Amino acid sequence: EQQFTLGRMLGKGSVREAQLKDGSFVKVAVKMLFLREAACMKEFDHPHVAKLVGVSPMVILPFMKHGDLHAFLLASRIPLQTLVRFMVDIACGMEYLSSRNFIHRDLAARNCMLAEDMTVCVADFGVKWLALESLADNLYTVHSDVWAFGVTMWEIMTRGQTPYAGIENAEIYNYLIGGNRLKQPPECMEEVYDLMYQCWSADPKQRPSFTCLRMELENILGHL
Numbered sequence: 001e002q003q004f005t006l007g008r009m010l011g012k013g014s015v016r017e018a019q020l021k022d023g024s025f026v027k028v029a030v031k032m033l034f035l036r037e038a039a040c041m042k043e044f045d046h047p048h049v050a051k052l053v054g055v056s057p058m059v060i061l062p063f064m065k066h067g068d069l070h071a072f073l074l075a076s077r078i079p080l081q082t083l084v085r086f087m088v089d090i091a092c093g094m095e096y097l098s099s100r101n102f103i104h105r106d107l108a109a110r111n112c113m114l115a116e117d118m119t120v121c122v123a124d125f126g127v128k129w130l131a132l133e134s135l136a137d138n139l140y141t142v143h144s145d146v147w148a149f150g151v152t153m154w155e156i157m158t159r160g161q162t163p164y165a166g167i168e169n170a171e172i173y174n175y176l177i178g179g180n181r182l183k184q185p186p187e188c189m190e191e192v193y194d195l196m197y198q199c200w201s202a203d204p205k206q207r208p209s210f211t212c213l214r215m216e217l218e219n220i221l222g223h224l
């Protein structure tokens, strides 16, 4: 298939803007690099998960003008209420995906997209976001998805900072095993950091579910 016109580069892994064609012309985004798993991912539908437009190899996703969450956070830096709502949005998307038995593996702010209405959707159906057992055993589960969510929470709170900035990738395992984590940002709400810290328990069963996270973030959102 080639009913779309490859255009300007959006990010570089390569993502490029394109123009998909019954009526007129729709602007999409094409990830340039399978069909069995894309048949499973096509069925997903939720206001906080980025839809699959299709596949062709390359992946066809909706074009989203406000770009990715990570750049947005960075752009602002160079209100807690808005930050907490971003987290709620990601949690809704993730709660949905894990309810469909989908393990994401690559959750990060860069993989979260700002929609037209400035809601955040989880994108990208598929070491600094990886749980200890993802690192030690290549075990990927809902619980390692929650670990990655917790790092994403930290990214939101620090407004786009690189996690473990003073530490090399090769030293991350060693850092974490020693019981060290990402430190509480200055002016970060205790309640926010507590929930985030819970996401990084060495014991994967001691990590909250996405339902639990959504509820406990939604609770915080009501105590504005």
Ligand SMILES: O=C(NCCCN1CCCC1=O)c1cnc(NCCc2ccncc2)nc1NC1CCCC1
Binding pocket: 010, 011, 012, 015, 028, 029, 030, 031, 061, 062, 063, 064, 065, 066, 067, 068, 110, 111, 113, 123, 124, 125
């Ligand atoms: O770049 C984009 N839009 C314009 C942003 C430019 N902005 C934003 C504020 C100021 C300004 O000038 C963009 C638009 N649509 C898509 N569609 C999702 C596709 C996708 C699929 C799977 N994984 C990951 C992304 N991705 C985009 N970017 C990707 C390439 C790098 C990060 C994500």
